[PDB]
Design a protein around this ligand. Structure first.
Ligand SMILES: Nc1ncnc2c1ncn2[C@@H]1O[C@H](COP(=O)(O)O)[C@@H](O)[C@H]1O
Ligand SMILES: [Mg+2]
Ligand SMILES: [Mg+2]
Length: 200
């Protein structure tokens, strides 16, 4: 069946961008915080959270970071820091109705890095608690591997290739990466896939 019933009322698509450099900067810090709220059955985008984030440990974006992500210094200057952005997320979650225990939602990311490594690592560095809703997620690469029977080599680009989808927007823009996740999910649901939590 195409677009079967799903286990969640909403899927929350997230794909950070972070400071970076060649070789890699340390520590990395989140600079773009997107969440797309997808209707759980149709995978259509119903709401968007989007904030750029001001880094503090390495406050000046490197040339490599701006080239990779397209994020220029003026986009992070004057922004709230991660601590405040996380409070804005909680407020957005509340207004969207996602803190009701009987509304079931789950984050979806391309890989485990965002919520297994990046967010808890920075929150630990800053001494910040991680909200419980960030502690479960679906790794789209793993979901795709069950839906298609194969392991994608390079993330969103190869999942779009395998599904004959045109890429949306710019790779390594957090919000555009989220739109591609959402488009891949919609196609997997069209083919009949029922999404499941993959995080441990
Ligand atoms: N090729 C790369 N070299 C160095 N850092 C990278 C690279 N690709 C991604 N990153 C880092 O990982 C973050 C998330 O990657 P992505 O979602 O692919 O844009 C980026 O914002 C960078 O901080
Ligand atoms: Mg990513
Ligand atoms: Mg990204």
């Amino acid at each position: 069946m195409s677009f079967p019933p799903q286990r969640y009322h909403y899927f929350l698509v997230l794909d950070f961008e972070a400071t970076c450099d060649k070789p890699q900067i340390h520590p990395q810090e989140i600079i773009e915080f997107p969440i797309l709220k997808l209707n759980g059955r149709t995978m259509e985008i119903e709401s968007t959270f989007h904030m750029y984030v001001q880094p503090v440990v390495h406050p000046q974006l490197t040339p490599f970071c701006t080239e990779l992500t397209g994020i220029i210094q003026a986009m992070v200057d004057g922004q709230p820091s991660l601590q405040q952005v996380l409070e804005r997320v909680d407020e957005w979650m509340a207004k969207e109705g996602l803190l009701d225990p009987n509304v079931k939602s789950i984050f979806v990311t391309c890989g485990d890095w965002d919520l297994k490594v990046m967010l808890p690592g920075q929150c630990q560095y800053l001494g910040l608690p991680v909200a419980d809703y960030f502690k479960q997620w679906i790794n789209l690469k793993k979901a795709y591997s069950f839906a298609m029977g194969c392991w994608p080599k390079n993330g969103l680009l190869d999942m779009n290739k395998g599904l004959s989808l045109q890429h949306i927007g710019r790779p390594h823009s957090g919000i555009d990466d989220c739109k591609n996740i959402a488009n891949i999910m919609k196609t997997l649901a069209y083919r009949g896939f029922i999404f499941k939590q993959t995080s441990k």
